[PDB]
Amino acid sequence: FAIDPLKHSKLYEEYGLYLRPHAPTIRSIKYASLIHSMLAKHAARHNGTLINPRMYADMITLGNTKVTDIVTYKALTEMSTLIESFRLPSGLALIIFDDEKYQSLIPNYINQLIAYTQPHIIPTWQGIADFSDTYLRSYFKRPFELTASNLAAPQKYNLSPMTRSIFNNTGREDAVIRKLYGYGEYVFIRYEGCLITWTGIYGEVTMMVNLSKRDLGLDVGDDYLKEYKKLLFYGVITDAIPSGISARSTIMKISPHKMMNPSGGALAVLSKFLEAVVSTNVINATLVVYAEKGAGKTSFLSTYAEQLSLASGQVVGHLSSDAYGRWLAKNKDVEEPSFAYDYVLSLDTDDNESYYEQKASELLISHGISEVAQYELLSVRKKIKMMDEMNEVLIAQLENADTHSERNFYYMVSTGKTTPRTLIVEGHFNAQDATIARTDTTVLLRTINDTTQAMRDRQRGGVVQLFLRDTYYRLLPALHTTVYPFEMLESIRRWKWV
Amino acid sequence: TELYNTIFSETRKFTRESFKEIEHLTAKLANDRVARHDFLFNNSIALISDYSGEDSNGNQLQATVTIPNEITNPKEYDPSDYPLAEDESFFKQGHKYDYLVTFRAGSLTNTYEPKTKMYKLHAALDKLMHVKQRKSRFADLWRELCAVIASLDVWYQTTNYPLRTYVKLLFHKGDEFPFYESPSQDKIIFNDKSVASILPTFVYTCCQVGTAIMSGILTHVESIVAMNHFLHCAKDSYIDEKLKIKGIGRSWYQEALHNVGRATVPVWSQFNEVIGHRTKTTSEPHFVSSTFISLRAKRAELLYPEFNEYINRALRLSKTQNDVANYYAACRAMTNDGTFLATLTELSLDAAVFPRIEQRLVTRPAVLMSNTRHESLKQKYANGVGSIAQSYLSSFTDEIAKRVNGIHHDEAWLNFLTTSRIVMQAVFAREYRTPERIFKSLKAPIKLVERQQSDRRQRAISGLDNDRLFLSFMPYTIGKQIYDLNDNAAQGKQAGNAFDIGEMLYWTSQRNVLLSSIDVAGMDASVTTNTKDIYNTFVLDVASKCTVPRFGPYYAKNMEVFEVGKRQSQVKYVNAAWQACALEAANSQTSTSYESEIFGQVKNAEGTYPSGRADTSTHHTVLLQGLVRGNELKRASDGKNSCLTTIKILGDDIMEIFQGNENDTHDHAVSNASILNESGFATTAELSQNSIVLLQQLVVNGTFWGFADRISLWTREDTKDIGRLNLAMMELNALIDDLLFRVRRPEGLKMLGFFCGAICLRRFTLSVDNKLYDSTYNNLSKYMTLVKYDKNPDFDSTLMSLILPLAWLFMPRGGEYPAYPFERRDGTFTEDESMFTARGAYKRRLLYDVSNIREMIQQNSMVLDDDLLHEYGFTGALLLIDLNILDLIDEVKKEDISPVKVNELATSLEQLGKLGEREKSRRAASDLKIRGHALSNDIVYGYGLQEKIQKSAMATKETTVQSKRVSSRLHEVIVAKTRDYKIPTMPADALHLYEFEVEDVTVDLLPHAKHTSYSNLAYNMSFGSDGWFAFALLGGLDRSANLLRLDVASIRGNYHKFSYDDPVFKQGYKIYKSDATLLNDFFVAISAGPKEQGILLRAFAYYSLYGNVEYHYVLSPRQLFFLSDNPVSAERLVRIPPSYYVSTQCRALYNIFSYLHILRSITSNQGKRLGMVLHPGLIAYVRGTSQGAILPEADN
C-alpha cells in the first residue's frame, strides 16, 4: 500500500476496511510495514529524499534486484537483506485509492517511487473503496450487512470474529444488536453520514447527507419539505442533472454512510477569500457567488453571512441576486438615485418586482406565451430566438457605466461610507464578472434542487421565472469553481480565527 | 567662439584647425554648466513672433510662435483633479486625468501627517512629478538639449531659427536652470518653484522636434506648428490630450491619397524584386469614401485649429503620392514627441486592464459529457460564432492529438523548471505529484506586470509563474501545435530587412485587391469568460483523443461520468491531459492584483487576462484564426464566393488580403467584420484599396512609409543611464542605423549623432589613489586632457575626470561611427563616410587613409604616418583603447542590438518554447564544465533567456555610479604604455592598403533605376538621392542568402557572421587544440547547426595554419534595408587591371573591397567606373594564404 495500514489504521477504519488479526497473506502486511519503516528511516537520513529511487522501486515492487560509497549503497544493501529475508516468490505491488484525500496524504518517499512504478488504482463508487478487489479481500475484513430481513444470530450464517465485520443497516442500536443477538465479538463499522434514495419525476434519485441519521430526523416515507433546510445545507445529489427531485418526493430508503470529504480546490478558493477577510492590508473583501435561478441560494448565503460574522467578529453584508433589478425597477426614472446600503437592502424584499422580470414578461406576452404549458410546448429554435432578444435587454445595462448602470450600482454600493467591509454579492451569469465588484475570488454554487423543476412547481411567477432560468443557464457555463454549501460551512470551521 | 561661426560649420570638413576648434567647443559644452546656460539662453538672440517659409513639399506656409498663458503662469494645484472614492479605497470611477496636470510646481504640498490616506496619495503624486519624469537616455537633459541645438546651429549656419525662441521663452527663468536632475537622488530638483510641472517633458519634446528638423521631416515653419500643437495639448493634461488626438490627427492620408487620382508605383514579385512600374488609380471605393464625412466632422471638432488648417492644406495641395507621404510624415511628427508615457500604475490600471463588454453576449456550448462535479469534459456548440469557429478548429484535433501523444510531459515540465537534475527531480517528486499543488495553484494570486511604450498607454502583460502556469501548461502544449499545421500565424524569425515586409510589398502591387488591418491590442480586455469557452471546446476535443498516462498529479483511470440522455453515471477511461485541461477550464480566475503604496492590495474585476505570455497568445491566435477561417467555410456552406487569400495574425494585428470582384471583396469584408462584432469585439477594420497599416510600418502601393517617431533617441524606459561608454555608443549606433530609412535626410542624422556622442558621451570619471594621483595625471596628460579634483584627507582615494579626445568616436575598437573628411598632408580629403559604411575591422582603414594609401603604394611604405595622427588625437584615442579602462560588453548584451521586430507574437512564443533544446545545451555546458573545459555563460544557448527571466524577479537597485579604480597595477601599466607609445600595426593590416582611381567611363544602371524613380520606395531614396542611386547601382536583395541566414538563425535564435575574434571561436579553438573528443559536446552546448559546425571545423584548421587573417566587416541588416548583402553585385562597377590575375587568386576578396568602398563613397559617387590599385605588400600577403582562410564563411 501507499499509506501503511498498521501505523495509520484509523484512516482505513473510515472506509470500512478493518484489519484481519495478526496464512501467507498475513505475513505480507508485516513485511510491508517493515519496508515502510525502513524507507522512512532512509529518507529522513538524507534531507527527506531517497538517493537512488529507481533501485528502491525495483527492489520493493518487483523484488528482482539484490545489492551487495558509504552514503550511496549501504542503505541499498540494508534494504536488500531485508527484502531477501522475506523469501517472497514475487514483489509487492504499490496500491493507491482513487480518493483525493488518500492521494494527498501519501508520503514523499512513496511519491518518489510512484514515478517508477505501475501502481494499482482502486476505484471508489460512493467514496467507499470497493470490497471486490484482491488486495482488499485478502488484507482487510469483509463487511456483512444486517438488514430487517437479514437479522439473525451469527450461527445461522458462517460468520467468525476473525473474518467478517458487521454493517448495522437495520435501524436499531448497536449495543441492542450486540447484546440481544450475539454479536459481542464482532466489530461494527461506523458510518457518520447518510444515504437517502428519493422518489422522483424521472426515476429513483440518491442523495448523500453529511448529517448522522439521528441528527437528520427523517425516516422512510417522509416528505421532501420536512427538514429541507438541513438537507439543503448538507446534501449532494449523485445523479445527473436534471434529476427528478421536487417538493413532493418521498423517501424510499435511508442508510448510514461515509461522510463526504470537502474538495481541496473549493476550500482553497474559500480560504483565499478568508485571507482577504482577515488581513488589514485589504480594504474591501468581496465574494461573488454564482448559481442557477432557483437553487435556493439566499437561504443558505444569509446564514453563511451569519456564521462568518460570528466567527470573524466583523459585520458582513449580503446583497441578493435580484438587488440591482429591484433597485432599478424603482429608480430607473429618478435623475439622482440613492445608493445607500440600507436603502438597497430595504428594496431587496421579495414582494418587489424586478426590472428583468417586467421586461421578460412583456417579451413573453409579445409572443403570446402566458402559460407554463405554452412555454414547455415551444421548440428549441423558438426558445433560443427569444433568449437572443433577452440578451439585447441584458447588454444595455452591462454595456456602459452611466448613472443607472450595473457597474455603477455595484461600485457605489461597494465603495460607500456606511456599507459593510466584507460583502457577499450574488450573481446570475458569467457576463457580470466585469460588472460585479473587484474580487479575486468568485465561485459557482450547486445545491440539491432541480431548478427547472422548482421554477415549474412554483405558482407565483411561473413562465417568467422559468424563462429567466433558462436564459441564465444559457449565459452561465460552469467555468468557475464549483462549491457546495457543506464545503462553504466546513471552510469556516477549518479556518483558524485570530 | 560660437558654434555657428566655426570652420566646421561653414565647410563641414575636419582640417587641423577646424578639428581642434570644434573639439575645444564641444569639450566646453560637455563639462561646464555655465557654458550650457549661456549657449542656450544668450542675450544676443532675437526672438521670433512671426515667421515664414516653405512647408515639407515646398509650398509657402505662415506660422506664429504662440506660447499659452496656462504654461507661462500655471494654475495652483487643484486637489479635485485626482478624486477618490467615498470609501477612499481607490480613485474615482470616471476620472479624467491619468497623467500629470499642468499646474504650478510649488503648489503640491502635503501638510498631512504620515501614515494617512492623503499623505500617501500626495507622496505618490510627488513621486509622479519628480521621479517619473526622469527618463533620459545618455546624459543630463540640458546636455541632450544642447546637442540638438548645437547640431541645428552647425547645420543651418544661423542662430535665427524658431526652436531656440521656444527654448528661451520656456526655460529661461533666472540666471540658473529652472530644474536639474540628480543621479544620486534619482529625481528632478526644482529650482524655480513658480514653474509649470510639465517642462521636464518639454525638454525631451524640444529634443525630439529638433531631431525631426535635422531629419528633414519637419521644416522650421512646421516646427512652429508642431510646438504650438504640443503647447496647446499641455492644458490641462498633456498626455491625455495627445492620446485623445493621436489617431484622428493621422487618419487623413486616406482622403489625401484619394484626392491624388492616379499614381505610378513599382510592382514587386513574390521573390523580393521590383519587376516594373504601373500607372494605377488611387481613387477609393464608395464604402471607403463614406468614412470621409465622419472623419472631417471629427477633425473639425476636436483638433487644434492651426493643425487642422495644416491637415486641410495637405488634403487640397498634395499632387502626388510622394507629396502625401511627406505631409503624412510631417503630421506624424506633429502628433508624437517620442517620449515614453509613464504614470502612477494605479492611475492607468483602470483604463489599461479593466474588462469591458462589447456589442453582444457570448453564450455556452452544450455540455455533452461531464465530471461528477458537473465540470465539462466534452462539449459542443448549437449555433453561432462558437459553431463557426469550431467548424474550422475541429478539423485539426485528430492530427494534433498524434503530436501531443508523442512527447513526454513530465520531462517537459522538468525542462521548464530547470531552464527557468537529480535535485530538480526530487523537487518535482515532492511538489508536483501531490494534489496539494493544484490547491496551491488555485490559492496563490496573480501579480500585475506592466510595460511602458511610446505613443501608447501603459500595457498590462502577464508574467511567468511556477504555479498559475502549471495549470495552463497543458492547454498551451495542445494549442501550440497549429503553428506547424497552418499558414495563418506569423511566428517565424524576423530578418530585419525589406525581406521581412516582402509579402505586403507583393499584395499591394497586385490588381483588384482589398486590404484589411484590425488593431487588436485591446482584445484581452474584451475577451470574457464565455469567450474563452470557444477555445476550451477545441482543447477538450484534442484531449479526449489524446492518450497520456501521467501528467502528475493526474492519472489515467476509470472515472465516473455523466452523459446526455443517461440518467445515471457512466464510467470511461479518462486520461491525464483530459483531467488537466478539464480542471484548468473549470477553475478560472483572470483577475490580477497590484499591491500599491496608497491603497494596499488592489485587485481587478474578474474577466480580462493580459496578453503577454505564450499560453495566452496562443489563445488569442487560435480563436481569431478559427473565427475568420470558419467564416470562409460558412460562406461556402451558404453558397457565396470566398475571396480571401491570406491571414497573418501578427503580434497586434490581423491582416487580411481580399482579391476578386469589388462586390465580392466588400461582402466578405463586411461578413468578417460582423462576425467579430458577434463574438464580442468592437473592432473596426481599416478597409483600403491601396495602403495597409501596421505598427511601425505603412505599405502604400509597393512603397514603405516608415515611422521615424517610434525611435526615441533621447528617452528610455529601463533607466539604466550609467556612464558605460561602450554600451552607450553601441546603443547610439543601433538607434542611428535604425532611423536610417525612416529619415528623409541621413546627413542630418550623422551630424546629430556626432554632436550627441561629442557632448553627451564625452566625460568619464575614474578614482585614483592619493599617492599615485599626480603621477597618473602627468602620464596621461600628454595625450588627453584631464580635470583634477580636490584631494580629501578623510579618505583613501580621490576622483579625477577623463574627458575623451573627440577622435575616439571614429576609432576601430573603441567608439565607432561614420567620419567626416579629414585633411591629408597634400590637401586632399578622405572620402565622406556614408550611413552605409561597415564597422568592425574595416574602421582601421581610416588610419591608413589619412596616412595616404596613394602615397604608400607609390613609395612602397606600410608603416603609418604618426605625426598627423598625433595631431588629430588618434594616438591618444588608441592609447585610451589599449589601456582597457572602459567598460566591457558581454555577448548577451551584444545580442540586444535593440531592433524593433515586426510581430511580437514571436517574442511571446520565444520565452516558453524550445525547452528540450535549451535543456540539452545546459546539460552539455555543465557536463563539459565537469570535464575541465568550462565555457563562459554568454556562449551557452539558454543563458540569454534564463538571465532575463531571473532578472525581472528581483527588485534590487541597478543604479550605482560607475567609478574606475586606478590602483598600483593599472598605474604601472600606464607608465609602461605612455612612455613609449606609438601605434601598433598587426601584420594583417596589409589588406587595408588598396585604392580606387576614377575612370572616365560611365556605368550602366540597373533596369529598376527607372521603375523606382516615380514614387519612392522609402523616405531617403527620393529621386537622385544617395539611397536611390545606391539601389540603382547595387540592386538588393539576395533572397537565397536571407533564407539561408534565417534557416541558420532558426537553431541559435539569432544570426551572427563568423569572426576569428569571436569568444565562441576562441573557446572552441582551445577545446580543438587540447581535447578534440569534446567538440561534439561543445557544438551541442553552443547549439550549432550542421552548417555552422562545418564552418567552425574549417576555421579551426585554417587558424592552426595561418592565424587571424580574415577581412572582417560588420553591416547591420537594418542599416541595409533595401540594399544587397552579396558583394558580387559590385563586380561590374570596378575594373580590375589584368596584371593582378597573373599574381593572385582572390577575386571575391576584391569584390568585397569594391562593395565596401562603394557603400562608403555613395555620397560622392556620380556614376563613373573605378580602377583597383593594389599594394605590393598586399599582394605578397595574399599569395601566402589561401582565400578560404581569409573568408571562411563563404563557399568558393
Ligand SMILES: C[n+]1cn([C@@H]2O[C@H](COP(=O)(O)OP(=O)(O)OP(=O)(O)OC[C@H]3O[C@@H](n4cnc5c(N)ncnc54)[C@H](O)[C@@H]3O)[C@@H](O)[C@H]2O)c2nc(N)[nH]c(=O)c21
Ligand atoms: C544646483 N545644481 C547642481 N547640479 C549638479 O548637482 C551635482 C551635485 O549636487 P549639488 O552639490 O550641487 O546639490 P546640493 O549641494 O544642493 O545638495 P543638498 O545639500 O541640497 O541635498 C540635501 C538633501 O539630501 C537629503 N538627505 C540626504 N541624505 C540624508 C540623510 N542620511 N538623512 C536625512 N536626509 C538626507 C536631505 O533631506 C536633503 O533634502 C553637481 O555635480 C552639479 O553638477 C546642477 N546641474 C544643472 N544642469 N543645473 C543646476 O542648477 C545644478
